[PDB]
Amino acid sequence: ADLTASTTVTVTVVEPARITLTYKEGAPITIMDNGNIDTELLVGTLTLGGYKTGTTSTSVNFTDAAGDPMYLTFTSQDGNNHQFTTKVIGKDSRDFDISPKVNGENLVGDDVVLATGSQDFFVRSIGSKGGKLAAGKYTDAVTVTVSNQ
Amino acid sequence: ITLTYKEGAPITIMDNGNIDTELLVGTLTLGGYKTGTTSTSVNFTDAAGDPMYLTFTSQDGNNHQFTTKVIGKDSRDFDISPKVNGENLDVVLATGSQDFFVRSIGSKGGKLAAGKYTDAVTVTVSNQ
Amino acid sequence: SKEYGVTIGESRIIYPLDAAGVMVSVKNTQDYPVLIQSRIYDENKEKPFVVTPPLFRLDAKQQNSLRIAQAGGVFPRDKESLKWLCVKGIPPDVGVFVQFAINNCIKLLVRPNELKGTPIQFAENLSWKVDGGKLIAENPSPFYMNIGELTFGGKSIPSHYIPPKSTWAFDLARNVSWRIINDQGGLDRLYSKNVT
Numbered sequence: 001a002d003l004t005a006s007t008t009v010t011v012t013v014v015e016p017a018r019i020t021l022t023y024k025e026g027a028p029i030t031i032m033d034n035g036n037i038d039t040e041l042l043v044g045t046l047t048l049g050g051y052k053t054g055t056t057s058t059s060v061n062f063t064d065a066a067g068d069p070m071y072l073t074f075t076s077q078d079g080n081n082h083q084f085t086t087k088v089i090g091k092d093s094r095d096f097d098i099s100p101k102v103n104g105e106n107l108v109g110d111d112v113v114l115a116t117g118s119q120d121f122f123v124r125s126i127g128s129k130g131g132k133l134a135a136g137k138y139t140d141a142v143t144v145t146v147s148n149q
Numbered sequence: 150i151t152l153t154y155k156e157g158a159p160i161t162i163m164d165n166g167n168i169d170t171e172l173l174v175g176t177l178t179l180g181g182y183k184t185g186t187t188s189t190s191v192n193f194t195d196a197a198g199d200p201m202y203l204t205f206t207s208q209d210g211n212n213h214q215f216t217t218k219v220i221g222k223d224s225r226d227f228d229i230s231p232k233v234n235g236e237n238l239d240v241v242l243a244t245g246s247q248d249f250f251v252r253s254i255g256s257k258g259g260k261l262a263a264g265k266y267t268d269a270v271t272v273t274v275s276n277q
Numbered sequence: 278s279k280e281y282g283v284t285i286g287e288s289r290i291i292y293p294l295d296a297a298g299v300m301v302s303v304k305n306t307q308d309y310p311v312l313i314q315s316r317i318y319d320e321n322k323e324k325p326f327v328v329t330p331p332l333f334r335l336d337a338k339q340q341n342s343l344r345i346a347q348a349g350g351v352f353p354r355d356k357e358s359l360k361w362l363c364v365k366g367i368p369p370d371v372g373v374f375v376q377f378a379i380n381n382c383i384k385l386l387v388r389p390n391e392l393k394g395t396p397i398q399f400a401e402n403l404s405w406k407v408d409g410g411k412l413i414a415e416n417p418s419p420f421y422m423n424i425g426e427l428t429f430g431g432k433s434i435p436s437h438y439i440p441p442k443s444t445w446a447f448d449l450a451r452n453v454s455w456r457i458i459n460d461q462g463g464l465d466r467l468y469s470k471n472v473t
Contacts, residue, residue, distance in 0.1 A: 003181070005152040006271040009251070011174055011205055012159040013215075015263035015462030017288040019381045020306070021281040029371035043373055050164075050282065052462070054425040056435035074373060084371075111435045111448065123375070137372045144281075145380040147322075147361065148288050149425050149436050149458060159461075161286060209397075209459075210466045263463030264397075 017148045018050035029125070035132050041125040043086055049118040051146060058111045059147040060100035062088055064140050069105040071126065074138040084128040084138065090121040151180040151246075152272050160215075160253065166260020172253040174217055180246035182274050189239045190275040191231035193219055193249075195268050200236035203251065205266040214257040215266065221249040281379050282306035283313075283366040288462035289384040289423070290345060290362060292326075294354070298346035303364055305335040312367035315343055317385065320359045325350040326385065328362070335366075345385065356419040356441035358387040384438075386421055396420040396457055397465050403439065405453045406473045412447040414439045425464050426456040 026042040048060065066073035071085040087107050092098045098109040100121060157175040160168050179191065197204035199216065207213040218238070221229035229240045231249060286302030305311050313335050315328040329344045345362065352358045365380040399418035406413050412429055416422050416439040424436040430450025439445045451471040459465045 001277045002273050002275050003150040003277050004271060004273045005150045005181075006269065007152045007154050007177075009154050009175065009177075009203075009205075009268050009270050010156070011266045011268075012156070012461060013162060013168070013207075013261060013263050013266055013463070014159045014287050015162045017285040017381055017383050017462070018164065018306075019283055019379050021377055021379055023279040023281075023375065023377060025278070025373070029373060031371060037371055044375065046377075050284075052288070052425070054436050054458075054464075056437075058435065072375075074375075113433055113435050133371060135370050137374055139374045139376075141376050141378075143365070143378050143380050145363070145382060147382045148384070149423060149438075209463070263461035264459050264465070265461070 015052065019146050020049040021144055022047040022049070026123075031133065031135060037084060037125060037127065037133055039125055039127055043123040043125055046088070046121040046123065047118050048114070048121065048144070048146070051114065052149065053116050054149050055114045055146070056111055056149070057098050057100050057114060058106065059149065060114075061104060061145045062100060062102045063143045063145065064103065067103050069103045070107040072102060072123065072140055072142060074140045076134060077137045077139060078134065080134060082128070082133050082136070082138075083130065084133060085126045086123050087126055088121050088123055090119060150182065150272070150274050152270070153178045157251075162261055162263055167256045168215060168253050168261065170253055170255060174251040174253055177219065177249045177251060177270070178246060179242070179249060179272060179274075182242065183277050184244070186242050186274065186276065187239050188229050188231045188242065191242070192235060192273045192275070193231060193233045194271045194273065195234070198234050200234045201238050202254065203233060203268055203270065204257070205268050207262060207264055207266050209262060209264055211262065213259070213261045213266075215261060216254040216257060217251045218254055219249050220252055221247055279377070280307060281366065281368070281377055283364055283379045283381045285364055285381055285383055287383070289386055289458070289460070291460050292345065292347065292385055292387050294352055294387055294389045296347065298344050300342045300344055301362070302340055302342045303335065304340040305337060305366065308337050309369060310334060310336045313341070314365040314367060316363045316365075318361045318363065322361060326360060352387050352389070354389040354391045356389075357392070357421050359421055359438075359440070360385040360387065384421075384423070392419050395460055396422060397459050400457045400465055401468045403455065403468070404473065405470060409446070410449065412449060412453070412472075414445050414447070416441060416443055418442075423458040424455055425458040428454040
């Protein structure tokens with residue numbers, strides 16, 4: 001004889017929150033003959049990955065110790081406090097300028113959905129309000145916060 | 150004949166939308182059979198009816214599915230492979246009742262969406 | 278090139294109001310060791326729940342877990358409350374040197390046991406209207422409706438959650454299409470309605 005029983009089996013399948021970041025250095029920065037650094041130099045290329053499709057540009061915030069809204073600040077290591085600022089910008093699908101928050105504010109463009117898979121951002125030079133940048137090593141320690149949907 | 154189920158750890162979707170193989174999805178406990186019942190008299194079936202595999206489906210209307218296999222262990226830790234939808238891939242069951250692990254194989258097609266997946270499972274025990 | 282990564286084992290935490298605690302796994306996906314620093318913020322991301330350990334070393338390729346524990350606190354029982362769990366992975370001529378750290382934040386959704394069912398049961402209940410030059414979602418459910426996909430007139434709108442019993446205004450057509458994110462981090466089924 002055949003006997004039978006039956007059960008309903010339920011399984012929980014979860015999506016983790018994976019976030020990756022690749023930084024590719026740009027060319028070294030050369031000081032012009034008047035003592036300025038050029039503007040719009042590609043300082044470096046950031047690639048944000050891991051995130052779920054639907055992640056937006058306002059849910060990404062690059063912050064640093066100087067805390068200047070819209071700008072990352074690089075500072076000399078020689079104790080003289082020479083600083084220049086940089087912006088973080090990228091391109092959307094229609095090839096328009098976008099930006100993530102930088103210290104809590106967007107510099108350019110409308111809130112957008114990030115490209116599927118990964119999104120390239122470019123660190124670009126603005127300049128210094130001081131001027132007269134000495135030759136040397138300039139540093140920033142940058143936190144990238146992604147608030148997952 | 151009795152059949153209960155205890156859930157294992159949740160399944161984590163991998164970066165490629167698939168799942169890893171051989172994960173312990175959970176444990177089926179089969180009880181009540183006759184002295185000397187072997188694994189070839191046990192047949193686990195479900196609506197998909199895929200030989201050797203139990204098939205799990207999402208509840209989101211998109212019909213994501215993954216397959217699993219059903220494997221128990223005897224007293225020497227050798228595999229016990231009961232029929233699943235009529236097929237394997239012969240061992241005497243433990244007295245009283247016998248655990249069978251549900252083990253992951255993989256998605257059936259395309260990336261899985263996180264959520265709850267179900268399968269309505271039936272066991273038929275023969276030669277009783 | 279420099280590589281960074283932090284993986285949390287889930288993408289939101291459903292915290293049952295008054296439960297002792299929940300575990301969540303943290304993974305260092307990199308070739309180097311890191312300090313993992315975990316913090317909880319209020320719904321406004323201003324700096325009740327305790328994370329243990331608040332700071333600890335995680336070796337290369339290694340995985341560990343945090344305990345998130347409610348100690349005290351009073352929350353509404355007619356609706357979910359929202360916090361955020363942030364997991365930061367702390368790594369060890371004009372020349373530029375920039376070091377980065379990933380701060381991976383997920384929703385911590387405080388859920389009264391008094392609430393019946395889950396968001397996917399109520400996801401179709403959103404209504405929409407245009408007012409003040411904005412697309413406005415109304416959420417009559419007690420659950421955060423975490424939109425993961427939003428389309429208006431065939432154009433993509435960047436998502437945001439809709440708080441319980443409340444509204445959200447999106448910047449900028451009759452048809453609105455949306456999907457919420459379910460408790461497990463998956464994109465749920467598509468719903469549509471015209472604006473009122």
